[PDB]
Amino acid sequence: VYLDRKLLTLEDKELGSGNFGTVKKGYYQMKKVVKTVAVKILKNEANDPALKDELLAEANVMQQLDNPYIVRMIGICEAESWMLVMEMAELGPLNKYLQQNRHVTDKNIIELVHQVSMGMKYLEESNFVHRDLAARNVLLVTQHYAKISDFGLSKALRADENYYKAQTHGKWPVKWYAPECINYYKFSSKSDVWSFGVLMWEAFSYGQKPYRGMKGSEVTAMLEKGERMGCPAGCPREMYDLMNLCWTYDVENRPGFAAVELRLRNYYYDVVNHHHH
Template sequence: MVRKDWASQNSIALSWQEPDFPHGAILDYEIKYYEKEHEQLSYSSTRSKAPSVIITGLKPATKYIFHIRVRTAAGYSGYSQKFEFETGDETSDMAAEQGQILVIATAAVGGFTLLVILTLFFLITGRCQWYIKAKMKSEEKRRAHLQNGDLRFPGVKTYIDPDTYEDPSLAVHEFAKEIDPSRIRIERVIGAGEFGEVCSGRLKTPGKREIPVAIKTLKGGYVDRQRRDFLREASIMGQFDHPNIIRLEGVVTKSRPVMIVVEYMENGSLDSFLRKHDGHFTVIQLVGMLRGIASGMKYLSDMGYVHRDLAARNILVNSNLMCKVSDFGLSRVLEDDPEAAYTTSGGKIPIRWTAPEAIAYRKFSSASDAWSYGIVMWEVMSYGERPYWEMSNQDVILSIEEGYRLPAPMGCPASLHQLMLHCWQKERNHRPKFSDIVSFLDKLIRNPSTLHTLVEDVLVMPDSPGEVPEYPLFVSVSDWLDSIKMGQYKNNFMAAGFTTLDMVSRMSIE
């Protein structure tokens, strides 16, 4: 049986149980697919070493038919039965929510109508007047609860931009607790921030023992604008409550030095931690770290919040290898419109981690955060290597524009590099949402065998960093013919049985 793990407007992720095949070990799987309405016209195919695949370049809100067959040393098996799945559309989520509201509204109207009929019945018969009074009181209570918000549709909290406050200091006091400085004990300096030193220390909690904390301090001689910018991060952090987001303990604003106090992360930033422990972790441990980061980013995205500076240096690691998103200095809020993106003029942009549209037009969105997440994946799987190595920022921008994407680090599972490339699609609407990423990583963790196939087992790596690897996992014969401007010969290739790029590569003059 083939399962649909998730679907976006232009992509579908499929997985299936690896079968017990009597004719030897399974070499790979061939996935044939076509639009349901155009079954007789043409089809595309792709291959996967693992029992899962992400198929991209599909049409929104379209039904597709999928067949899968196995290749062993003895050759190909027959195709499986048909499996039909549909891509999503822009209105699918909205329609689902409207459907739920319609059901609730219908039930409410039906219940109210029944109540009116019962009330009239009792009025006409003159009986059970005590029941009518009790029922009316009960109904008034229910309405009061609804108005007070005790019963409401499920949802998530929405982020509030501190910059929308006329007096930003009000945002600090609304979202962050004021801490008495006598409860803080600074022990040692562990780093330097944009505004001052970062120290480790202890925080005495009321009625509890001391807990380890990190303390950001604002250096002396600051002006009001610097103080406001320093505390802005606390106004942002104080709105978040998630195990994969750094936790704000509170602030000190009524005495000097001004401080932001957060939970202490023993292993520091993820990039330096990985470089220090190069090669020490299993693939499952690395995927677990990536899953934690994706979960934190899903929470931020659900709140309508864009990070803008997602990178391994801004992920902190605790003693349990739990990763938490931090550093909200560059972050901004999204509009309600799902197509909207925050636009800013000026400001430094971390080129190697930033999506092309954000570099070119200063347009940031959750989709540009997804691009950055793909770079973080590459950093994790390469144990903190510098993205694009020694290439200049200008060379990085030009290479990305020409279609270059980072090759997989040595030892990287093919399924993870697939996800990286999916995050690095030029069209931002084609990139996966963080909910999709979390689901995909959960599937890999539940089926560790899918991580055994390494990229170097699937393709020959390019000779130099400047070459773009050819991925038979992604490209169909149809796509290849289009890319060399020979799309008119698709039917000829299919009729001759050349349905995969592997078969095309073995074509001879005969």
């Protein structure tokens, strides 16, 4: 959990940023092997304690998670700034990857979004809400291995509640948010199912931004009229049907991740069967 700064080598180049911090590539000297890592650091000229708490809360969520489809935390270190050391997903965000690799097949996309549903089925069983589930947060280890990242807005649900009630609205990724998040500030695993539907749309659209050219308020007004984004070009009908099911307005009738992962699992095997024929 607490790492040694002398065993960490950071490269100067920045990969990008999350809800909090900036990610740099590094190397960590493990018990024997050297491990390539992604290190989230803080740009905090003012020495604001809030920036440190946000990164530590993020580290606290990751420490409790252990799944093949979730980015693993190696540990933390307090040096030039607080640093959250994670495993490295070399290929990066799924939306940026697909934008640059249009040859990726529908079979390959189903495989990757199914892997995201396995990680989310795990997160839901663990009673954590992601709250920022989007293609930009799905990181590729390989073209055939996706992992969920950025737990900056994530919350451990209370033992007596199935949702997190936000106190402050903030800079919210509204285009990925369910109507109950917008209308009641209530975040559940079912709210994450809604974001997963938007993520699926982004994946089948080869990383295109959802609701293009629309303001957040126009998206809310569209969804309220019962309108949904159209089927992406070349997206299988079974996959567009599943996105629409994720976009069930009423939180009670919306499927949970166990039902979502099963649909994708069965569809993926049908496509694997089609390919062999």
